[PDB]
Write an enzyme that holds these catalytic residues in place. Structure first.
Site, PDB file in Angstrom:
ATOM      1  N   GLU A   1       0.798  -1.232   0.000  1.00  0.00           N
ATOM      2  CA  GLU A   1       0.000   0.000   0.000  1.00  0.00           C
ATOM      3  C   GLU A   1       0.822   1.268   0.000  1.00  0.00           C
ATOM      4  OE1 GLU A   1      -3.186   0.498  -0.612  1.00  0.00           O
ATOM      5  OE2 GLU A   1      -4.015  -1.470  -0.083  1.00  0.00           O
TER       6      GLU A   1
ATOM      7  N   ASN B   1      -7.488   9.532  -5.824  1.00  0.00           N
ATOM      8  CA  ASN B   1      -8.337   8.638  -6.612  1.00  0.00           C
ATOM      9  C   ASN B   1      -9.286   9.445  -7.529  1.00  0.00           C
ATOM     10  OD1 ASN B   1      -7.664   5.947  -5.021  1.00  0.00           O
ATOM     11  ND2 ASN B   1      -8.432   7.377  -3.454  1.00  0.00           N
TER      12      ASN B   1
ATOM     13  N   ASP C   1     -12.475   9.346  -7.841  1.00  0.00           N
ATOM     14  CA  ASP C   1     -13.684   9.874  -7.184  1.00  0.00           C
ATOM     15  C   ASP C   1     -13.396  11.121  -6.357  1.00  0.00           C
ATOM     16  OD1 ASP C   1     -12.301   8.475  -5.144  1.00  0.00           O
ATOM     17  OD2 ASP C   1     -14.193   7.986  -4.139  1.00  0.00           O
TER      18      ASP C   1
ATOM     19  N   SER D   1     -11.415  11.340  -3.788  1.00  0.00           N
ATOM     20  CA  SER D   1     -10.977  10.989  -2.422  1.00  0.00           C
ATOM     21  C   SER D   1      -9.437  10.810  -2.514  1.00  0.00           C
ATOM     22  CB  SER D   1     -11.622   9.745  -1.893  1.00  0.00           C
ATOM     23  OG  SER D   1     -11.240   8.656  -2.763  1.00  0.00           O
TER      24      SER D   1
ATOM     25  N   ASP E   1      -6.036   8.683  -0.467  1.00  0.00           N
ATOM     26  CA  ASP E   1      -5.617   7.585   0.435  1.00  0.00           C
ATOM     27  C   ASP E   1      -4.445   8.126   1.275  1.00  0.00           C
ATOM     28  OD1 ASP E   1      -7.598   5.690  -0.706  1.00  0.00           O
ATOM     29  OD2 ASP E   1      -6.240   5.692  -2.413  1.00  0.00           O
TER      30      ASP E   1
ATOM     31  N   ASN F   1      -8.711   5.624   3.145  1.00  0.00           N
ATOM     32  CA  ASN F   1      -9.524   6.476   2.287  1.00  0.00           C
ATOM     33  C   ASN F   1     -10.359   7.545   2.968  1.00  0.00           C
ATOM     34  OD1 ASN F   1     -12.237   6.688   0.408  1.00  0.00           O
ATOM     35  ND2 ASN F   1     -10.259   6.645  -0.711  1.00  0.00           N
TER      36      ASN F   1
HETATM   37  C1  LIG Z   1      -8.070   1.249   3.316  1.00  0.00           C
HETATM   38  C2  LIG Z   1      -9.238   1.912   2.678  1.00  0.00           C
HETATM   39  O1  LIG Z   1      -9.643   2.947   2.955  1.00  0.00           O
HETATM   40  N1  LIG Z   1      -9.819   1.172   1.702  1.00  0.00           N
HETATM   41  C3  LIG Z   1     -11.024   1.593   0.961  1.00  0.00           C
HETATM   42  C4  LIG Z   1     -12.243   0.796   1.377  1.00  0.00           C
HETATM   43  O2  LIG Z   1     -12.695   1.125   2.699  1.00  0.00           O
HETATM   44  C5  LIG Z   1     -13.419   1.134   0.396  1.00  0.00           C
HETATM   45  O3  LIG Z   1     -14.486   0.003   0.626  1.00  0.00           O
HETATM   46  C6  LIG Z   1     -15.848   0.220   1.150  1.00  0.00           C
HETATM   47  O4  LIG Z   1     -15.789   0.093   2.622  1.00  0.00           O
HETATM   48  C7  LIG Z   1     -17.131   0.528   3.075  1.00  0.00           C
HETATM   49  C8  LIG Z   1     -17.141   0.598   4.577  1.00  0.00           C
HETATM   50  O5  LIG Z   1     -16.518  -0.686   5.076  1.00  0.00           O
HETATM   51  C9  LIG Z   1     -18.119  -0.633   2.572  1.00  0.00           C
HETATM   52  O6  LIG Z   1     -19.360  -0.441   3.315  1.00  0.00           O
HETATM   53  C10 LIG Z   1     -20.223  -1.214   4.193  1.00  0.00           C
HETATM   54  O7  LIG Z   1     -20.326  -2.575   3.732  1.00  0.00           O
HETATM   55  C11 LIG Z   1     -20.776  -3.428   4.788  1.00  0.00           C
HETATM   56  C12 LIG Z   1     -20.873  -4.821   4.180  1.00  0.00           C
HETATM   57  O8  LIG Z   1     -19.956  -5.005   3.059  1.00  0.00           O
HETATM   58  C13 LIG Z   1     -22.145  -2.945   5.309  1.00  0.00           C
HETATM   59  O9  LIG Z   1     -22.417  -3.708   6.533  1.00  0.00           O
HETATM   60  C14 LIG Z   1     -22.223  -1.423   5.630  1.00  0.00           C
HETATM   61  O10 LIG Z   1     -23.615  -1.054   5.694  1.00  0.00           O
HETATM   62  C15 LIG Z   1     -21.568  -0.598   4.568  1.00  0.00           C
HETATM   63  N2  LIG Z   1     -21.215   0.803   5.086  1.00  0.00           N
HETATM   64  C16 LIG Z   1     -21.690   1.933   4.528  1.00  0.00           C
HETATM   65  C17 LIG Z   1     -21.600   3.137   5.402  1.00  0.00           C
HETATM   66  O11 LIG Z   1     -22.137   1.943   3.467  1.00  0.00           O
HETATM   67  C18 LIG Z   1     -18.301  -0.629   1.010  1.00  0.00           C
HETATM   68  O12 LIG Z   1     -19.160  -1.681   0.538  1.00  0.00           O
HETATM   69  C19 LIG Z   1     -16.858  -0.884   0.471  1.00  0.00           C
HETATM   70  N3  LIG Z   1     -16.879  -0.791  -0.992  1.00  0.00           N
HETATM   71  C20 LIG Z   1     -16.916  -1.863  -1.823  1.00  0.00           C
HETATM   72  C21 LIG Z   1     -17.051  -1.523  -3.271  1.00  0.00           C
HETATM   73  O13 LIG Z   1     -16.851  -2.940  -1.426  1.00  0.00           O
HETATM   74  C22 LIG Z   1     -13.079   1.222  -1.099  1.00  0.00           C
HETATM   75  C23 LIG Z   1     -14.181   1.837  -1.926  1.00  0.00           C
HETATM   76  O14 LIG Z   1     -14.391   3.298  -1.641  1.00  0.00           O
HETATM   77  O15 LIG Z   1     -11.901   2.098  -1.237  1.00  0.00           O
HETATM   78  C24 LIG Z   1     -10.778   1.411  -0.558  1.00  0.00           C
HETATM   79  O16 LIG Z   1      -9.638   2.213  -0.846  1.00  0.00           O
END
Ligand SMILES: CC(=O)N[C@@H]1[C@@H](O)[C@H](O[C@@H]2O[C@H](CO)[C@@H](O[C@@H]3O[C@H](CO)[C@@H](O)[C@H](O)[C@H]3NC(C)=O)[C@H](O)[C@H]2NC(C)=O)[C@@H](CO)O[C@H]1O
Length: 129
Positions: A35, A46, A48, A50, A52, A59
């Protein structure tokens, strides 16, 4: 700060990551390596809009506030800048929150593609832990 392999391993171990939510130490070290190349000051923007931040490239759209990500959540309740310190406490505490959200370590793209299913145990080879 640019951490040494063993150095980081030790720092994470003392911060409770060896086997946090079933993920061995090798996983975390490997993730940090791919990373940020063990650099606490690493930043990447990124598509979008945002950004890192730090050693674990956390993020800004979800975990921290950098005052420049539009419709953002600050789940770790922390300014993104706090994650670029030589002291990894902030990063690890935030990480704990991330890994417990439901997708585990899959939240780390570098982890998913370069660590998952590999012999992560090699990352702690020769370390004094
Ligand atoms: C290290 C870092 O920041 N990595 C980034 C990832 O965090 C990010 O992934 C998304 O994480 C969010 C929060 O964990 C996911 O949301 C949740 O999903 C769970 C079940 O999967 C659910 O219980 C929650 O309701 C829901 N939270 C909210 C508030 O919605 C979200 O699904 C992840 N995205 C995907 C596509 O899987 C990614 C994407 O922005 O970026 C990484 O850099």
């Amino acid at each position: 700060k640019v951490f040494g392999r063993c150095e980081l391993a030790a720092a994470m171990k003392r911060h409770g990551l060896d086997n946090y939510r079933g993920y061995s130490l090798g996983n975390w070290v490997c993730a940090a390596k791919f990373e940020s190349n063990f650099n606490t000051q690493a930043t990447n923007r990124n598509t979008d809009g945002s950004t890192d931040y730090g050693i674990l490239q956390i993020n800004s759209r979800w975990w921290c506030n950098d005052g420049r990500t539009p419709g953002s959540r600050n789940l770790c309740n922390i300014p993104c800048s706090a994650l670029l310190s030589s002291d990894i406490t902030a990063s690890v505490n935030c990480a704990k929150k991330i890994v417990s959200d439901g997708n585990g370590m899959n939240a780390w793209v570098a982890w998913r593609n370069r660590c998952k299913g590999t012999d992560v145990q090699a990352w702690i080879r020769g370390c004094r832990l």
